[PDB]
Amino acid sequence: YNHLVIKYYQSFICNTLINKKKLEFNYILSSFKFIKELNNIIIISLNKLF
Amino acid sequence: NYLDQPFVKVPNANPNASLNFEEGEVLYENTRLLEWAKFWNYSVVVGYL
């Protein structure tokens, strides 16, 4: 969450500076889906096991 | 048993509360002694080996 917030803040600053008006979501969510899925499945497996 | 002396108490393991161990100012300093000691010790170890 902290990494995503920092990336969003940096993208917003850059877009305001360059007058782009579009956020670089491709960079903001670099591996968010992968990390979230890995953590969720790991936690679910641990809960089922123990 | 040997610490339990009959007539005199053995010194306390901890320093007296009166003493303050806050650092003050440096009186003497010869740091190159460390380097000389390292050199001599390593040389003697190598020669002995």
């Binding site: 990494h3 995503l4 940096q10 850059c14 500076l17 956020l23 979501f25 | -």
Partner: protein, 209 residues
């Protein structure tokens, strides 16, 4: 004599006592921090490929089975951290106009120079402490990302995140300056004219010339 001239120039630059360089006077000189990311990406890719090959073959050791995932995870984390650190807008140079009411800046973003002009001194403000950054979740077009951010923040669609949690990778090597509507990072290791710099950061306008 050549070394004397170079030393005098170095002293002048360090003290930040440069003269008026034409229409504008340079009053700040800073540099950004560069971190290694390609070596870490290569190491992570190598670790992943090696783990896949070991799983496919079956001739690996328990030692390497333990080590390779750890090395890959460390490389991935370092890559992410270095990318975030590199892509930090860092103020590189700042110039003041003759009238003393206008400021121009050049900033570095991952080694890319971006020039901003027409910045009134009245809008400059240096954040002594940790400010608050506002994040609009409605802008996000990913339902999963929006839900995750909302759950983590525990707030409405517009969430305010204190900069204390972000200074670790956002402005750990500098302070935060407000260049009008945008915000930039001012490194501590820089050469600048302190007298003018303090006034402009506080927002006061210096006298002409």
């Amino acid at each position: 004599l050549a070394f004397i001239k170079e030393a005098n120039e170095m002293i002048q630059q360090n003290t930040g006592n440069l003269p008026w360089d034409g229409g504008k006077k340079k009053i700040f000189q800073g540099q950004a921090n560069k971190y290694l990311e390609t070596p870490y990406y290569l190491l992570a890719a190598l670790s992943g490929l090696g783990l896949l090959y070991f799983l496919y073959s079956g001739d690996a050791k328990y030692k390497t089975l333990v080590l390779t995932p750890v090395v890959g995870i460390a490389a991935f984390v370092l890559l992410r951290r270095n990318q975030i650190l590199n892509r930090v807008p860092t103020l590189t140079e700042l110039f003041l106009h003759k009238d003393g009411k206008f400021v121009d800046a050049v900033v570095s973003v991952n080694g890319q120079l971006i020039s901003k002009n027409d910045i009134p001194v009245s809008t400059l403000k240096l954040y002594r402490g940790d400010h608050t950054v506002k994040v609009n979740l409605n802008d996000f077009e990913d339902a999963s990302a929006k839900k995750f951010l909302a759950q983590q923040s525990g707030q409405e669609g517009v969430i305010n995140v204190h900069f204390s949690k972000l200074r670790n990778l956002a402005a750990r090597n500098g302070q935060v300056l407000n260049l009008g509507d945008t915000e930039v990072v001012v490194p501590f290791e820089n050469q600048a004219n302190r007298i003018i710099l303090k006034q402009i950061f506080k927002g006061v306008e210096v006298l002409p010339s």
